[PDB]
Amino acid sequence: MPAYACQRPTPLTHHNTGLSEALEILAEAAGFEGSEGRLLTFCRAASVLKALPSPVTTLSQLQGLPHFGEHSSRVVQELLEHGVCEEVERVRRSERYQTMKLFTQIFGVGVKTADRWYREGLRTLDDLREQPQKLTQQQKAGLQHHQDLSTPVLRSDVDALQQVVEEAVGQALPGATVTLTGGFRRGKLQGHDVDFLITHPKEGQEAGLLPRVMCRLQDQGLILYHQHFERSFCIFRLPQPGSWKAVRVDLVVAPVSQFPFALLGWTGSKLFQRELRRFSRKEKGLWLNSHGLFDPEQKTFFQAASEEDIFRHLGLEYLPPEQRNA
DNA sequence: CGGCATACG
DNA sequence: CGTAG
DNA sequence: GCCG
Ligand SMILES: [Mn+2]
Ligand SMILES: [Mn+2]
Ligand code: NA
Ligand code: NA
């Protein structure tokens, strides 16, 4: 088992779902207390389990696996023995975890805002609605639309949304293309948001595109919320039987030179991208982001024409999107 | 021990 | 501060 | 919390 998530296929569905989940609860809780190091380790340990070819049935099968030390191993041990890990259950039950989860799930609220609100004694969504003068416009939108935003987005919704985005994009700039990215590109059948990546085959033609797309979507009555320039985090109005629902949509523009890097980054998973960037820097001495891959010795950027190019330039075996579910 | 990804709005 | 993967 |  290699040590970095970008070095191993991780399928969407796997053979250690209960174990990986429990570890992810501990990761999430560590994040709520500002412990990014502990979050990372619990996430990595969970991901290692997702990459295994069969179920872990005995403690000995953890020996030699990366990111499994005393703590993660004890969690698995307790799950294998008793079907439950007391630490995990204590977190699940806790007022702190439940409230931080509720608040951080709101669009416009991060850990720091959620934590301050927690310390002020706030606990429920209606507590936040009672004091709306404190809220940002983005948090107001997140709170107004919270119920719809909690409802899973289906693949039929995605196809509907892609058509409307394409229409606006085609008027904004003929020849521009729209690519589905994020969790849906990794093969998820549902999600809590939709992500699109827009470019144009002629380098430079994509300059100034996003405002033009946004204004057209706005004039179609489709935008319930937007911030307004290359990333737009919107709430769209999606048609439903005799009605509609609010849906989070992210629209991203990149020049065709950067498209493979943007595609890679926006396809995820989050852990996969962190691990890939960590690997690039620490193992290969190259600096990776969603715009490019930089050699800080030569002071040059790697020109990639495809995701395949990028994996090759990092010396990694290619993983299709459905094996990047770290 | 230090490091933990790296951006844009 | 929020957002993204 | 774990790794190198
Ligand atoms: Mn997404
Ligand atoms: Mn998104
Ligand atoms: Na949030
Ligand atoms: Na840019």
Token couple for A87? 């630490």
**Closest C-alpha to A310, from A297, A298, A321:** A321
- If asked whether residues A178 and A268 sit together in one domain, one would say no
Q: Tell me how far the alpha carbon of residue A228 is from its chain's centroid.
A: 22
Token couple for A5? 């998530």
Neighbours of ion ligand 2 (CB under 5 A): A 193, 195, 250
Nearest DNA or RNA nucleotide to A41 (CA to C1'): D1
CA distance A55 to A43: 18
Place of tokens 């389990």: A49
Listed residues A204, A228, A256: the one ending a domain? A256
Burial status of residue A82 (CB atoms within 10 A of its CB: 0-12, 13-18, 19 or more): exposed
Question: Are the C-beta atoms of A220 and A238 separated by less than 8 Å?
Answer: no
With b for 16 or more beta-carbon neighbours within 10 A and e for fewer, the A138-150 pattern comes to: bbebbbbbbebbe
CA distance A180 to A40: 27
CA distance A191 to A226: 20
**Closest C-alpha to A179, from A61, A307, A70:** A307
Place of tokens 């699940």: A92
For A189, phi then psi, to 5°, come to -90, -20
Token couple for A8? 């191993």
Token couple for A274? 């962190």
Token couple for A56? 């872990």
| CATH code: domain of residue A118 | 1.10.150.20
What is the tally of structural domains in chain A?
Answer: 4
Per DSSP bridges, beta strands A231-240 and A223-225 are antiparallel
Token couple for A63? 């020996």
- Is A159 marked within a binding site? no
Q: Report, in ranges, which bases of strand C sit under 7 Å from a protein C-beta.
A: 1-5
Q: Give one DSSP letter per residue of A105-124, joined into a string.
A: TSTT--HHHHHHHHHTT--S
| CATH code: domain of residue A45 | 1.10.150.110
Residue A261 belongs to domain spanning: 257-325
Question: Are the C-beta atoms of A173 and A206 separated by less than 8 Å?
Answer: yes
In the chain, the amino acid numbered A191 is G
Burial status of residue A301 (CB atoms within 10 A of its CB: 0-12, 13-18, 19 or more): middle
- If asked whether residues A268 and A204 sit together in one domain, one would say no
Q: How far is CA A198 from CA A58, A123, A164, A239, in A?
A: 47, 39, 13, 23
Per DSSP bridges, beta strands A243-253 and A231-240 are antiparallel
